[PDB]
Symmetry: D2
Subunit: 353 residues, 4 copies
């Protein structure tokens, strides 16, 4: 499947990204779905605004060096230049970070099912990843989404999603790109915490069997899951020790140790819940043989975005907000996080990007 030279390259890359203290910034929103984040702060969705906004994030003045191993970028963002003319991958790489690339092509429905979806992307994938590798990306991301309704997530969806996740992983590692396997269970719903924990266990079990089946090399992988969390509409209330227990036991029962790190997705939690729960998790007493960090998008950019507010004059003001959150999360990601747009929940029904 893979030579040893090729396994060292992936294992290396994978550990780099989640070395101690570091997480991933998810700046990988599609054009259409970044556009509605910009509309949130009354900014027109334009190549330059998008470029400007991404540039603000990749140029954050260096206390974020120890906190941000990697950045997932959307396809166009990887071919965009800082204002000095320098391509964004080289701007971020020079500072010791690693560039990632969102390669899925969005979700697609599953006939005969109660709203579930595959996602698509695999076509032309390997040649795309060849390009993205030569243009500076050392890891990729692929988002699949399941939801919890009563007859959701069905076997059919879990089986097909874990499988496409495995196809993609296998194509990425062929091209020396560490795959990020994201089986996101959406928080959409009334479900309680344990319901979510069970669905997450069944999903990840299915994904890691799929990965085994497709002979993907787990030491050169990372996993971006949802934390385990009550449904949005869940009335019952659950602590962060309970969410971190639920989340950590879910992961100990499914994710074999060889997986090099677990970079959590925000899930639509507020920026601060995200860092508290991330921290709680790392402080969970149980034994956690993988890197438990963050790959947050919205939970590292809410404060930033509403600082920037479409206006060039706050660039520094927005990127100091960004930095604050990265530092918060680089401590949560060690257990060392002790602490109001950052508490605004960032929930989005059927989050798409």
């Amino acid at each position: 499947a893979l030579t040893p030279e090729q396994k060292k390259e992936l294992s290396d890359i994978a550990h780099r990204i989640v070395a101690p203290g570091k997480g991933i910034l998810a700046a990988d929103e599609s054009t259409g779905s970044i556009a509605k984040r910009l509309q949130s702060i009354g900014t027109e969705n334009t190549e330059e605004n998008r470029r400007f906004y991404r540039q603000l994030l990749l140029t954050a003045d260096d206390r974020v060096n120890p906190c941000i191993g990697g950045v997932i970028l959307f396809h166009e963002t990887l071919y965009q230049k800082a204002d000095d003319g320098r391509p964004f991958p080289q701007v971020f790489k020079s500072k010791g970070g690693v560039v990632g690339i969102k390669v899925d092509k969005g979700v697609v429905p599953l006939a005969g099912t109660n709203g579930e979806t595959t996602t698509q992307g695999l076509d032309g994938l390997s040649e795309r990843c060849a390009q993205y590798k030569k243009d500076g990306a050392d890891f990729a991301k692929w988002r699949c989404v399941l939801k919890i309704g009563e007859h959701t997530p069905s076997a059919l969806a879990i089986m097909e999603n874990a499988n496409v996740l495995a196809r993609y992983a296998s194509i990425c590692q062929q091209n020396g790109i560490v795959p990020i396997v994201e089986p996101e269970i959406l928080p959409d719903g009334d479900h309680d915490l344990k319901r979510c924990q069970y669905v997450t266990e069944k999903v990840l079990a299915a994904v890691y069997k799929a990965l085994s089946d497709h002979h993907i090399y787990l030491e050169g992988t990372l996993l971006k899951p949802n934390m385990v969390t009550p449904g949005h509409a869940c009335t019952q209330k659950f602590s962060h020790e309970e969410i971190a227990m639920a989340t950590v036991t879910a992961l100990r029962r499914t994710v074999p140790p060889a997986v090099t790190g677990i970079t959590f997705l925000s899930g639509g939690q507020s920026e601060e819940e995200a860092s508290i729960n991330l921290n709680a998790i790392n402080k969970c007493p149980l034994l956690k043989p993988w890197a438990l960090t963050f790959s947050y998008g919205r939970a590292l950019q809410a404060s930033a975005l509403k600082a920037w507010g479409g206006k060039k004059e706050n660039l520094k003001a927005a990127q100091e907000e960004y930095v604050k959150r990265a530092l918060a999360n680089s401590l949560a990601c060690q257990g060392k996080y002790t602490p109001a747009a950052a508490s605004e929940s960032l929930f989005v029904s059927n989050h798409a990007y």
Copy 2:
């Protein structure tokens, strides 16, 4: 999963294609694969050469019109005009024929395996089928490929080409297009007839499970299976009765009677051996609750292509060769067939198009 009006349209469309005596012409070859076909008769691979050849086949005389209920076309040639300026789909729909479109986008390796392959094309398939339906196509073809070797076809290779065919079928049918699922086991190899049987059985069983699993509507499908023949390099010889029993046994054990019909591919058999074997099969005493007919590419055009020689002067001779193999096959799929470049083996190693 599908409304009743939709199941009616599919069921109807599928029964038209494979009504008694009708078979299908597979004119579905890639510009890359009809390349090598044209070089075998000195002709250059130029659009109007492709357009002309395809034009010759589709415009054969109406002695063929009870023999050919459908034509699988390649993308390009769905959108070419004949010499009257008529779009190709109409010249054929005018005659009471049905226009099929190949939707797969080639094959692609499966990492971890001794040579095996999966097939790609699902990205965008939803919209493509939609357009193709508005533009004439009423059925689609997706080709999957297993080879037989000592560790081939893997379990992973079977489970992946099965759950891609199903994904594809699911999408065609939601867009009102009758999928032809083609799980082709290639004759490449030394293998016994009984071996090709066991593989053929195990494959169809995993296909029909997959179609079950994705809630496909078997009444508006067709199976395009290989015959079960010994390897191309097999030393033992087996009778046309044995090929014909092995094929009809293998399918009696795996293919729900609900499937509307099955369109055999030629596989590399000579034109004439295809007709004979199709005939033995339909003359088999066993009970075969589906339509057993042909969807032949090379075993309808070889005689016509060599007669065509690239020379516009040869048109009606080229076509009355095509027309004879169409009449031969339209009796072989009824049992009534009875009888030199139509004797030639048309075997390409690892066929691809």
Copy 3:
């Protein structure tokens, strides 16, 4: 797996049992669960009563010869002698019938599931079947049960039941015993007809993949399914043309043609509904490439039992009731059935035996 001599023996046996006009009498109730049928007619459950009652059935005076190919007997009933000293297998075999044997050992729950069950039996099976073969049994039965609730029948249960069914089938054919594969979907419930039809399609798809997976020889098998039928508690009303359509399309979409016959279980329908629906089915216009007959227990013995009423003096009176029903069902099993304890529904919540 199996030689050809061994495949002829099974195929032979299987066709014998479901030759035209013939069905199977299911006299295979366990001791404890026959005891509550006897309690129904105020008879003590004793070796002799049980023997007497079984003997009454196997000795029915010869117009049942053309109607009853086979009889499934419970284990003790196979070692019991008619009053003339003759062992029951030899009494029934002399008349041209074939003896069958119930080899499962009842159901067992599935941890973590909403009431579902495996069944058990496989242990020591092959040596048991060796004995049952030498003692006259040429076919066996194995009952698995699924139910329809909202979260019933789960994947886990369908997967494990279809698998044990396949294990058992494979052990039976090793010992020249034709297996009867019964995936019974219980009528317990409020479900409508199509719900049942879908669950039956998903179940049988799963069973026939399982059989393929375990390399069982379908031509030497029979299948005892539920018909497709509204739930007991279903309020909506459905015709017999609708139940026969539902049942026949369900079977055309799952049961490959090689399966030699389909012997239906009564399901708790009244004795007469059972024969009407069986008949309707055979008159379904759609193409039915397997034998569609009956393997009824309760729908051939309700009238008999309440005739016999624990009293030796009605023996002839009870066995003329038995005969009537066998004849009714040997015509329904041809399509030729034209027609009040026989309309008493025989439904039993979680039927067990």
Copy 4:
């Protein structure tokens, strides 16, 4: 699926067994398999000979009591009394030890396969575990067996021994008994180390999927895996560091950290090679989030059995041999081990007991 008190009892019981330094003695041999062990030292296979041998092992001095937290017993010997009239389970429970019971009932062929096997014993397992729990047993062992050959272990063989182990685990745990799931890949064969690795990986991956699928509680399980060693007849030699990395890699890629501990079997290694390899494994720099210890049959008793010679006079010499291998292993499972019939290969072809 299981209450919290029950999960506590299982989790506790499992942690006792495999607490730091403790390992398990597998005294679990069939009367048929301890037959051939006794004939290897001239002793006749008589109950009191079995009783005495077992008595010798269980009553070794309390220098062993930090080395042996459990004993897997065969059915017979759970119910034998020592010389003080004490039941065996108590003589061992008295010392702070835990009594294990083997519940499998031998293996049985899988038809359709080149030699492969499944294992039986699930019939009655529910009640048996119940009794066994009341009578002393707090954990069970079920042995499954894959061999490595060219078409071995089949997919069917893996999926069947996986879903039997899970059925078994499910039943033990509902009856409050900690299952030891033993997927043993036998060293029979010519195969490379890397080969045994790939098979070992693919097997555990299908096991842990199965346990997921049946809702097993991994905190109250133990894995009894083979080491990953080259075939018994392999020509290449591999270092104790390589065996030890291959074993610990294979498990890091498949075994959820939730599993309480893993008890290696001896496999045929010499007593001494078992201790060395257990030690290399625990001295591996990789991170191993589970307890890595021993559940050794032949690699604890060989020295003791040859010393025993059948001669009651040899008792304390027999046992201080046993006790030395118990002390050796109780350091090898801590890394602290450092160092002639304990050098002998104990390989039985196709081991069975």
